[PDB]
Design a protein around this ligand. Structure first.
Ligand code: SF4
Lengths: 97, 69, 171, 5, 96, 111, 155, 105, 231, 83, 316
C-alpha cells in the first residue's frame, strides 16, 4: 500500500532521472540499475504478499536480464569511452549528418 | 627458545575461549535452564508462541508438563 | 517496528532521489549501495530472507564492478557531489519538501484513495501461514529447477550468449 | 614416464 | 560416512516430521478455536464502537460469497495492542 | 537483534571516529594536507580517465556473479521430487557456465 | 591536588607513544642499510616495537638516513609535512647530521637540521644498529619525558 | 501474433505458473487461491467480454480479496471511530485489547 | 595516461629513485627514470683531495658492495703507480672481495625478495650478514665502510683466530643458501612471477652497456675475473 | 590412439588442472547410468511429509490405502529405514 | 542481551589485538627474532599501546578529498567486520539466522567495498591503484568464494550455519573435501588480503596500497577490520571444513576443541602469510580464473553428482 506508493514514487523519480542526461551515460546506467532495483523490490513484495512461491524466480530472471543488460551497457561504454576519451553524451553529436 | 609465543598465545586463548562459553551460559541463564530454540521454519515459531501463551506470563522458558491439567 | 517498512521505503525514496538528481556516478554508486541495503532489509523484514539477501550480494558485486568502472573511465577533473552544485542540493531540499507534502496530503488533507497512511503495520503482510514448514522463500526461488525449468534454461542460455556478447563487443 | 607425470 | 550420516539424518528428519504430521490437528483445532474467538472479540467490540454511525452493520464482510474467507493478520489482530501486532507480523522474521 | 547489533556497532564505531577526531590537538596546514604521491606537487589530477585492461574479465565476473546467483537456490532445489530433471538441467547450466569460460580461455578473454 | 593525576595520565599517554612508535621505511643513503640492520634479527626493531610502515600517515617518526641532496630536499619536506603532527625526526648518519661527507659539495644539503626539526642526532657513517637502537631508546625517553598534559594544566 | 506453439505442442513452458492458483512448491497455497480458482472456473468457456459482465461479482470479490481495499477502509473506519470514542469517553478500556487478556491456549 | 611519479619514498625504489611513468592502465607504456636524487658530487670532490683522502668514497658509492670498489680503486691506483701488491695481501683482496660478493648477492636476493614480497630472506639472510659484519668490524672496525684496501696492499693484518671463524661461518652458510634455494626457487609463486617477463636479447644486452649479472642472465660468458685476470 | 594418449599424458604432466576438471566432469557424466542408488532420492523426497497428506473419504471399494496408520500393511518405509 | 554483546564484542577486540600481538610474535619467530617482549610481561602490552597511540595520532582531512565519504568508509569497515562476527555458529549463535552464511558471503562482498571507497576518496593515484586492485581482488575471489561456499554446503544441504555443527560430530569435513579446503584457504587469503594474495595494501607495490591518506584512528579502524577479518575467516574455515567433537551436555569441550583447532589454523594463516612471496594480479586472475575456477565448477559438478550417487539428499 504505502510502501508500494513510495516504491512507485521512487520508480517515477528513477524514470525522471533516466529520461534526462546531466554528466555521463554511466550515471544513466546507474539510474537504470536503481530503477530495476526498485522494480525487483516491487516484484518481491508482490510475490511475497500474495504467498505465491511459483512466481518467486521471476525476480531471479528479472535480475538476470537486469545485470546482463547492464553488462552489455558497460561493454558498450568501454567501447565508446576508449573511442572518445571521455564518455560524455554531449560529445555524441555526429549522428545528425 | 619457543616458550615465548605461549603466554601471549594463552592470553589470546582465554580471550578466544570466553565468547561461545559465555553465550551458552547466558543462554542457559536467560531461557529457563534450557537453551534458546532456533526458529528455522514457521512451525518452530508457532510452537514457540503456543508455549508462550500456555505458560501465560508472556515468557516461553517455563513449560507446563503433565502437572497443569 | 510498526512503521519499519514505511520508514525504510521513505529511505528508499530518499536514496532513489539522490540517484535521480544524478551526481558524478561514484556518489550514485554510494547512494545506490545505500538503497540496495535498504531494499535488502525491506525484503528481509517481509519473511523471505533469500531474495533480498542474494540481490544484496548481486548488487554489492555488480555495484563494486560498476564502481571500479566509474572510477576508471567515467570521471572528470572536478567531481560533482550532492553538495558541490546548489541545484542538486536545492533539488534535494525541494524533493524532501515534496515528500513531506505528499505524506501530509496522504495523512490529513483528504484521505481519499487506495493509498493510506493510517494503515501502518497491520497491512504489511496480508496472510502468512503459521503452522507450515515450507514457508521460507528459498524453495520458491528453487522452483525454477523443478517446475519452471524453461525460464531457467532461457536465462542460462542468455548468460552463455551474453559471455559471447561481451567477447564480441570488447575486442 | 607415468611416474614423472 | 557422509552417506551414513545423511541417511540417518533423513531418518531423523522423517521421525521429527512424523511427530509433526501426527501433531498438526491438535494445532489446527487450537488454530480455528482462537481465530474464531479473536474475531468474535472483534465482533463484540464493534457493536460498542459503531452503534452510533449509520449504514454499517456489525459483523459485516465485503466479500460476496458465503464461503469462509481466511482472516488476515490485520483483520485478526488489528484491534489489539501494537506490541502484540508487531509480535504477530514480525514474529518469525525478526526472531534473528 | 540484528538491527540492534548493527545499531550498537555503528554507534561504537561512530564514537571511535569521534574519539579519533576530538581527542588529539587540531592544527592543520596546506603542506600537511596536500595529497601523497611520495611528496610531490600534482602532475595530474587523480580523477582522470583510467584505461585499465581487465575490463572484459570484469564483465565476465558480473556474468559469473549472475550465474552463481542462479546457482544459489541449490540446497532447496535438491529437496524436490524431480531430481533427474533438476539434475540434467543443472548439469547443462553449470556445463555452459564452464563453457563460457572455456571460450574466453580459448579466445584470450582473460588476459 | 590533580597535578599527580595529570602527570600520571601524561606518562600513560606517553607510554604508548614511547613503546609502539612506528617509523618510516626510508632510504636515501649508504647509511640506510643500517636501518635494515636494525630490522635484521641481531639488534631488533620489533622487540622494542618498531615497525617499518611505508606511509607517512602510518608513520610516527622519520628516521632520515644519510645523504640529503638538493633534488631530494622538497621531496623530503613534502613527505615530512604530510606526516601527521605526532612526528619526530631521528637523523641517522653524518650526512643527515651535518652533511658529513660531501659538506663542501655543490648539491648536498648541509645536514637535515637545515630543513626539518630534528629531535635526535645519531653520529656514524656506520651508526651501529646498537647505536641507532640507542637512538630509538633515547628518542623514546625524550618523548617520554616531554610533558604535554602538564604544560596544558599550568596554562 | 499469439502463434500458439505451446498450444500446438501440449507442453507448458510457462503456462503452468500463469495465474495465482497454479501448482506450488510442495503445495503451499497462495492467498485467495479459492477466489482465483472460482474466478478462473467462472471465466472458462465464456470469453473475456462476457466474462466482464457475468463474472463481475467474482472478479470484484477476488480483487477485494487481493487488494483488501474495502477491508482496509473498514479497519481504518473502525480505528477512527474507536479513536473518536476514546476521546469522547463512551468507550471502556478494552481488556481483550489492552494486553491483560486471558490467552488461549 | 597518468604521469605518475613513482617517488623516492616508495620502498621498492630503494629510497632514491624518481621514476615517472606515463601509464595507460597498469600496463606501463614508458618509464623515464630521473636519477640524481642522491647526487653528491663525488667526482668533483675527489679532485680537491689527495688519493688516500679519495679512498673512502668507494666505501660509500656501491654501499652494499664496499671492499670490491676499494679493490677497484686501489687496483687502478696501483696500476697507475706500477706497484704490485704482496701476494698475502692479494689473497686478502680476493677473500674479503668474495665476502663482499656474498654481501652484494645477499642484498640482491634479499631486495629482490622484498620487492616481489617474500619478506622472509629480508631477515634470514641478514642474520648471516650480521655474522659477516662481525668479520668486517673485526678487520677494520666499521661494519660497512672499511677503507681496508689501500694502494700498496691492505692496511692492517687480520686479528688472530679470524680464519677459523671464517671457516665456521662458511661451513654453515651453505645450508642457508640451499635453504633459501629450497624456499624461493622451486616454489610456484616465483615460477609464476619470473617467467617470460623482462627478457632482454643479447644484442640489447651488449648494446645497452649491460654488464656482469645482466650479461650472465642473458647467457654470454663475461665474468671479469677469469676472462680478464686481475688481482 | 597413441597420439591422443601422448596428448593427454603430456597435458597431465604440464597443466593437469583443466584435464582433471574434464576427468571428474566426465566421471559426473558417467555416474547416473551405473549408479544403483539413483532411484532412491526422488522417492525419499516423495516419502518425506512436508505437507499434510489429506485423509481420503471411506467408500469401501477396495483396501488400496489403510484405514489405520500404525499397522504395517499399506505403503511402508521398512526397506528405506534399513538403508 | 547487552551483557552477551559486551562479552562477545569487547573480548573479540581484545583477542584481535592479542592476535596482532601473536601475529607479530610468531611472524618474528618465523623471521628468527624474539618479538615484542620488552614492553609487556612477555609482550602482552604492545598492540594495546598501538590502539591507544593511534587515538591521539593526528587524523587527516586533505584538500583533495571528500571528507564525508572519507570518514564514512572506516566506520563502515569496523561495523562491517564486527557485525560479520554475529552469525558465527560457536556452540550456540547469538544471531540464530536461518540462512546466515549468505549474510556472511554478502557482508564479505561488502568487505571489498569500503577499501574501494577509501581508495577513491583518498584522492591519490596510489590509493586509486589500490582501489583498482581491490576491484581486481573482487574479480579474483568472489565467484570461487561462492562456489566453494555452495558445493560443500550442498553436502550439508542448508544455509543455516547451525546445521553444520550437527553434521561433523564424529568426523571432520576436510576428509570428504580435501581439495575444497585448500582452495577455500587460498580464496579466503584473497578475501582476507594476506601476503600471498595481498595485492592492495603492499609496501613493495605501492606506498601501503589503500592506506595512503589514512592516519590515526581511521587507520586503526582499517587495521581493526583487517585483523578482525583475519580471525573471522580463520573461524569460518574452522567452522566449515574441520569438525570438532560435539557433546550437547558439554559445549565447553567443543569450545576448547575450537580453541586448539582455531589456534593451529590462525598459526597456519600467519605462517602462510609470512612464508610466501607476494603475487601480481595478472597471475592472480590467471590462476584463479583459468586454473581454479573450472576446478571449483568441476568439484561443484561432483557435488551435484553425490546426493543422486548415494544416500538421498540432505535434510532441510
Ligand atoms: S655519512 Fe657517509 S656513508 Fe653515511 S650517508 Fe653520508 S657518505 Fe653515505
Amino acid at each position: 500500500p504505502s510502501t508500494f506508493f513510495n516504491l512507485t514514487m521512487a520508480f517515477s523519480l528513477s524514470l525522471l532521472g533516466t529520461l534526462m542526461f546531466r554528466s555521463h551515460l554511466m550515471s544513466t546506467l546507474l539510474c537504470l540499475e536503481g530503477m530495476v532495483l526498485s522494480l525487483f523490490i516491487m516484484t518481491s513484495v508482490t510475490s511475497l504478499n500474495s504467498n505465491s512461491m511459483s512466481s518467486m524466480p521471476i525476480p531471479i530472471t528479472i535480475l538476470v536480464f537486469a545485470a546482463c543488460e547492464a553488462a552489455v551497457g558497460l561493454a558498450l561504454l568501454v567501447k565508446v569511452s576508449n573511442t572518445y576519451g571521455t564518455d560524455y553524451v554531449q560529445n555524441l553529436n555526429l549522428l545528425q549528418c | 627458545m619457543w616458550f615465548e609465543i605461549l603466554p601471549g598465545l594463552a592470553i589470546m586463548g582465554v580471550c578466544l575461549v570466553i565468547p561461545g562459553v559465555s553465550t551458552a551460559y547466558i543462554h542457559k541463564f536467560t531461557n529457563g535452564g534450557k537453551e534458546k530454540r532456533v526458529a528455522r521454519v514457521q512451525y518452530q515459531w508457532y510452537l514457540m508462541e503456543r508455549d508462550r501463551r500456555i505458560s501465560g506470563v508472556n515468557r516461553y522458558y517455563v513449560s507446563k508438563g503433565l502437572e497443569n491439567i | 517496528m510498526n512503521n519499519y517498512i514505511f520508514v525504510l521505503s521513505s529511505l528508499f525514496l530518499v536514496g532513489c532521489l539522490g540517484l535521480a538528481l544524478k551526481p558524478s556516478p561514484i556518489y550514485g554508486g554510494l547512494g545506490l549501495i545505500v538503497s540496495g541495503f535498504v531494499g535488502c532489509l525491506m525484503v528481509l523484514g517481509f519473511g523471505g530472507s533469500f531474495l533480498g539477501l542474494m540481490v544484496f550480494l548481486i548488487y554489492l558485486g555488480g555495484m563494486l564492478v560498476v564502481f571500479g568502472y566509474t572510477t576508471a573511465m567515467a570521471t572528470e577533473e572536478y567531481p560533482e557531489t550532492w553538495g558541490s552544485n546548489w541545484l542538486i542540493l536545492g533539488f534535494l531540499v525541494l524533493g524532501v519538501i515534496m515528500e513531506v507534502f505528499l505524506i501530509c496530503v496522504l495523512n490529513y488533507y483528504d484521505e481519499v484513495g487506495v493509498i493510506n497512511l493510517d494503515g501502518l503495520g497491520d497491512w504489511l503482510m496480508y496472510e502468512v501461514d503459521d503452522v507450515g514448514v515450507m514457508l521460507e522463500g528459498g524453495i520458491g526461488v528453487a522452483a525454477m529447477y523443478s517446475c519452471a525449468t524453461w525460464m531457467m534454461v532461457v536465462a542460462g542460455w542468455s548468460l552463455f550468449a551474453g559471455i559471447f556478447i561481451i567477447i564480441e563487443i570488447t575486442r | 614416464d607415468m611416474k614423472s607425470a | 560416512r557422509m552417506m551414513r550420516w545423511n541417511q540417518e539424518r533423513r531418518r531423523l528428519l522423517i521421525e521429527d516430521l512424523e511427530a509433526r504430521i501426527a501433531l498438526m490437528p491438535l494445532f489446527q483445532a487450537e488454530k480455528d478455536r482462537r481465530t474464531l474467538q479473536i474475531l468474535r472479540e472483534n465482533l463484540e467490540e464493534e457493536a460498542i464502537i459503531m452503534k452510533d454511525v449509520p449504514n454499517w452493520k456489525v459483523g459485516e464482510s465485503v466479500f460476496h460469497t458465503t464461503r469462509w474467507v481466511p482472516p488476515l493478520i490485520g483483520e485478526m489482530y488489528g484491534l489489539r495492542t501494537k506490541e502484540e501486532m508487531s509480535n504477530a507480523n514480525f514474529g518469525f522474521t525478526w526472531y534473528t | 537483534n540484528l538491527y540492534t547489533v548493527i545499531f550498537i556497532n555503528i554507534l561504537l564505531s561512530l564514537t571511535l571516529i569521534l574519539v579519533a577526531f576530538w581527542l588529539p590537538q587540531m592544527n592543520l596546514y596546506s603542506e600537511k594536507a596536500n595529497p601523497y604521491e611520495c611528496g610531490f606537487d600534482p602532475t595530474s589530477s587523480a580523477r582522470l580517465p583510467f584505461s585499465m585492461k581487465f575490463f572484459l574479465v570484469a564483465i565476465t565476473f558480473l556474468l559469473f556473479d549472475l550465474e552463481i546467483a542462479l546457482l544459489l537456490p541449490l540446497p532447496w532445489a535438491i529437496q524436490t521430487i524431480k531430481t533427474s530433471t533438476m539434475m540434467i538441467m543443472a548439469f547443462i547450466l553449470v556445463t555452459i557456465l564452464s563453457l563460457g569460460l572455456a571460450y574466453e580461455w580459448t579466445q584470450k578473454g582473460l588476459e | 591536588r590533580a597535578e599527580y593525576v595529570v602527570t600520571k595520565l601524561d606518562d600513560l599517554i606517553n607510554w604508548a607513544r614511547r613503546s609502539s612508535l612506528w617509523p618510516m621505511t626510508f632510504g636515501l643513503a649508504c647509511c640506510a642499510v643500517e636501518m635494515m640492520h636494525m630490522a635484521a634479527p641481531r639488534y631488533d626493531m620489533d622487540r622494542f616495537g618498531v615497525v617499518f610502515r611505508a606511509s607517512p600517515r602510518q608513520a610516527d617518526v622519520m628516521i632520515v638516513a644519510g645523504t640529503l641532496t638538493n633534488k631530494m630536499a622538497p621531496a623530503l619536506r613534502k613527505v615530512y609535512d604530510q606526516m601527521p603532527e605526532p612526528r619526530y625526526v631521528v637523523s641517522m648518519g653524518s650526512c643527515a647530521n651535518g652533511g658529513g661527507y660531501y659538506h663542501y659539495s655543490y648539491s648536498v644539503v648541509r645536514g637535515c637540521d637545515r630543513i626539518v626539526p630534528v629531535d635526535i642526532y645519531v653520529p656514524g657513517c656506520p651508526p651501529t644498529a646498537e647505536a641507532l637502537l640507542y637512538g630509538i631508546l633515547q628518542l623514546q625517553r625524550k618523548i617520554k619525558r616531554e610533558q604535554k598534559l602538564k604544560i596544558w594544566y599550568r596554562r | 501474433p499469439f502463434l500458439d506453439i505451446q498450444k500446438k505442442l501440449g507442453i507448458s513452458l510457462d503456462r503452468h505458473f500463469m495465474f495465482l492458483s497454479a501448482e506450488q512448491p510442495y503445495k503451499n497455497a497462495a492467498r485467495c487461491h479459492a477466489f482465483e480458482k472460482e474466478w478462473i472456473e467462472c471465466a472458462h468457456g465464456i470469453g473475456g467480454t462476457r466474462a466482464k459482465k457475468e463474472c463481475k461479482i467474482e472478479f470484484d470479490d477476488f480483487e477485494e480479496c487481493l487488494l483488501r481495499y474495502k477491508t482496509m477502509r473498514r479497519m481504518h473506519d473502525i480505528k477512527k471511530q474507536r479513536e473518536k470514542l476514546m476521546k469522547e469517553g463512551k468507550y471502556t478500556p478494552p481488556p481483550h485489547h489492552s494486553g491483560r487478556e486471558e490467552p488461549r491456549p | 595516461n597518468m604521469t605518475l611519479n613513482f617517488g623516492p619514498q616508495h620502498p621498492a625504489a630503494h629510497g632514491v629513485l624518481r621514476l615517472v611513468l606515463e601509464l595507460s592502465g597498469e600496463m606501463v607504456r614508458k618509464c623515464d627514470p630521473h636519477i640524481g636524487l642522491l647526487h653528491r658530487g663525488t667526482e668533483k670532490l675527489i679532485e680537491y683531495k689527495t688519493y688516500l683522502q679519495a679512498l673512502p668514497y668507494f666505501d660509500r658509492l656501491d654501499y652494499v658492495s664496499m671492499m670490491c670498489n676499494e679493490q677497484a680503486y686501489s687496483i687502478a691506483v696501483e696500476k697507475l703507480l706500477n706497484i704490485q701488491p704482496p701476494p698475502r695481501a692479494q689473497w686478502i683482496r680476493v677473500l674479503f672481495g668474495e665476502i663482499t660478493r656474498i654481501l652484494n648477492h645477499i642484498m640482491a636476493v634479499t631486495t629482490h625478495a622484498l620487492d616481489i614480497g617474500a619478506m622472509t630472506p629480508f631477515f634470514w639472510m641478514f642474520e648471516e650478514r650480521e655474522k659477516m659484519f662481525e668479520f668486517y668490524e673485526r678487520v677494520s672496525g666499521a661494519r660497512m665502510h672499511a677503507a681496508y684496501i689501500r694502494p700498496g696492499g691492505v692496511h692492517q693484518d687480520l686479528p688472530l683466530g679470524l680464519l677459523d671463524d671464517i671457516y665456521e661461518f662458511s661451513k654453515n652458510f651453505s645450508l642457508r643458501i640451499d635453504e633459501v634455494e629450497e624456499m624461493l626457487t622451486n616454489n610456484r609463486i616465483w615460477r609464476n612471477r619470473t617467467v617470460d617477463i623482462g627478457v632482454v636479447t643479447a644484442e640489447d644486452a651488449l648494446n645497452y652497456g649491460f654488464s656482469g649479472v645482466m650479461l650472465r642472465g642473458s647467457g654470454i660468458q663475461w665474468d671479469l675475473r677469469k676472462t680478464q685476470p686481475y688481482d | 590412439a597413441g597420439r591422443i594418449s601422448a596428448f593427454l599424458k603430456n597435458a597431465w604432466a604440464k597443466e593437469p588442472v583443466l584435464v582433471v576438471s574434464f576427468s571428474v566432469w566426465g566421471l559426473a557424466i558417467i555416474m547416473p547410468m551405473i549408479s544403483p542408488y539413483t532411484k532412491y532420492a526422488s522417492m525419499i523426497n516423495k516419502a518425506t511429509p512436508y505437507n499434510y497428506p489429506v485423509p481420503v473419504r471411506d467408500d469401501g471399494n477396495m483396501p488400496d490405502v489403510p484405514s489405520h496408520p500404525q499397522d504395517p500393511l499399506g505403503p511402508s518405509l521398512d526397506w528405506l529405514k534399513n538403508l | 542481551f547487552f551483557i552477551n554483546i559486551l562479552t562477545l564484542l569487547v573480548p573479540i577486540l581484545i583477542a584481535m589485538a592479542f592476535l596482532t600481538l601473536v601475529e607479530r610474535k610468531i611472524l618474528g619467530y618465523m623471521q628468527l627474532r624474539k618479538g615484542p617482549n620488552i614492553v609487556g610481561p612477555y609482550g602482552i602490552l604492545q598492540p594495546f599501546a598501538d590502539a591507544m597511540k593511534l587515538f591521539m595520532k593526528e587524523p587527516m582531512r586533505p584538500l583533495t578529498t571528500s571528507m564525508s565519504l572519507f570518514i564514512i568508509a572506516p566506520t563502515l569497515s569496523l561495523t562491517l567486520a564486527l557485525s560479520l562476527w554475529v552469525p558465527l555458529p560457536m556452540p550456540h549463535p547469538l544471531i540464530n539466522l536461518n540462512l546466515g552464511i549468505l549474510f556472511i558471503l554478502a557482508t564479505s562482498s561488502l568487505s571489498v567495498y569500503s577499501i574501494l571507497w577509501s581508495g577513491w576518496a583518498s584522492n591519490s593515484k596510489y590509493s586509486l591503484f589500490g582501489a583498482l586492485r581491490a576491484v581486481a581482488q573482487t574479480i579474483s575471489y568472489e565467484v570461487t568464494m561462492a562456489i566453494i561456499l555452495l558445493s560443500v554446503l550442498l553436502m550439508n544441504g542448508s544455509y543455516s550455519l547451525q546445521t553444520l555443527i550437527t553434521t561433523q560430530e564424529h568426523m571432520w569435513l576436510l576428509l570428504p573435501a580435501w581439495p575444497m579446503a585448500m582452495m577455500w584457504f587460498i580464496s579466503t587469503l584473497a578475501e582476507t588480503n594476506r601476503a600471498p594474495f595481498d595485492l592492495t595494501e603492499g609496501e613493495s607495490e605501492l606506498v601501503s596500497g589503500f592506506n595512503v591518506e589514512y592516519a590515526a584512528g581511521p587507520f586503526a579502524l582499517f587495521f581493526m577490520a583487517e585483523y578482525t577479518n583475519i580471525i573471522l575467516m580463520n573461524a569460518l574455515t574452522t567452522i566449515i571444513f574441520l569438525g570438532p567433537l560435539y557433546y550437547i551436555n558439554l559445549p565447553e569441550l567443543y569450545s576448547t576443541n575450537f580453541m586448539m583447532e582455531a589456534l593451529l589454523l590462525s598459526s597456519t594463516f600467519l605462517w602462510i602469510r609470512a612464508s610466501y612471496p607476494r603475487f601480481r594480479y595478472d597471475q592472480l586472475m590467471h590462476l584463479l580464473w583459468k586454473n581454479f575456477l573450472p576446478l571449483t565448477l568441476a568439484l561443484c559438478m561432483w557435488h551435484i553428482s553425490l546426493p543422486i550417487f548415494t544416500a538421498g539428499v540432505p535434510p532441510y
